[PDB]
Amino acid sequence: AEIVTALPVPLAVGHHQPAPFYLTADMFGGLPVQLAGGELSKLVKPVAAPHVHEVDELYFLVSPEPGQARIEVHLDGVRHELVSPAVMRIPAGSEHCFLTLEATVGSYCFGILVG
Amino acid sequence: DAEIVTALPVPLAVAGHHQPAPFYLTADMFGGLPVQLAGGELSKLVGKPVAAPHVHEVDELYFLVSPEPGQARIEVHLDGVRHELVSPAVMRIPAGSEHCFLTLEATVGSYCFGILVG
Ligand SMILES: C[C@H](c1c[nH]c2ccccc12)[C@H](N)C(=O)O
Numbered sequence: 084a085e086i087v088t089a090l091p092v093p094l095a096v097g098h099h100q101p102a103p104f105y106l107t108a109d110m111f112g113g114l115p116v117q118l119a120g121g122e123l124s125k126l127v128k129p130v131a132a133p134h135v136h137e138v139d140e141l142y143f144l145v146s147p148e149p150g151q152a153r154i155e156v157h158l159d160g161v162r163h164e165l166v167s168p169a170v171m172r173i174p175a176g177s178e179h180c181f182l183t184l185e186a187t188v189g190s191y192c193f194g195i196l197v198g
Numbered sequence: 199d200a201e202i203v204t205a206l207p208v209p210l211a212v213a214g215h216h217q218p219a220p221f222y223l224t225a226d227m228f229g230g231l232p233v234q235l236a237g238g239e240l241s242k243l244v245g246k247p248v249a250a251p252h253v254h255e256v257d258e259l260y261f262l263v264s265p266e267p268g269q270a271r272i273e274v275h276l277d278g279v280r281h282e283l284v285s286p287a288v289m290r291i292p293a294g295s296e297h298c299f300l301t302l303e304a305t306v307g308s309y310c311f312g313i314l315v316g
Pocket residue numbers: 096102103119120121122140179180181192193194
């Protein structure tokens with residue numbers, strides 16, 4: 084049985100700290116996605132830095148009950164306010180970041196890099 | 199301009215599942231995705247399996263996560279063998295393998311996501 088428990092894996096990605104990855108491209112002989120992120124309640128953090136990926140990134144915002152988490156996604160000079168649950172596509176090459184406005188314990192934003 | 203999906207989750211029928219499963223990523227989104235992602239918060243599912251044992255023809259990953267490590271625990275049945283996963287954990291279910299999970303323990307904010315890998 085293939086079980087990975089040494090998680091998250093910190094990987095450096097404009098981002099101050101290594102991002103915490105729960106799926107990496109090399110797991111299980113190869114995955115078509117990578118998945119990073121974490122709980123938002125301790126992330127509610129005055130600044131966020133813009134950055135670009137060479138692949139598409141999907142933001143996946145979720146909370147135990149709908150509406151309990153809220154983020155601002157900055158995408159190429161446009162501010163977008165999203166309420167959980169939400170999924171937003173960041174096209175490869177686009178400068179982007181997000182800020183957590185509100186989040187209950189158990190709210191997550193995952194960044195999913197699509198190969 | 200920006201592609202945003204908020205009509206979520208998308209209920210989709212999955213083999214063996216009593217009710218439609220809540221999907222947050224589907225294969226047709228954004229012109230095509232190599233994965234589908236379904237699942238949700240486990241705090242009300244302790245003791246209550248969402249599905250009978252079932253088989254997919256694609257690989258499925260269980261992604262178990264909680265705000266603090268250890269706050270969520272599920273039992274995965276994999277071709278008649280029980281495996282206990284403690285958050286955070288990722289488990290690969292090879293295509294063709296009979297499987298299901300039972301929630302053993304979950305705080306508010308514990309999730310199990312099933313990721314179908316094309
Ligand atoms: C991986 C980055 C991320 C998304 N959600 C997160 C939650 C906590 C810590 C990092 C993240 C992503 N590339 C971004 O654009 O921020």
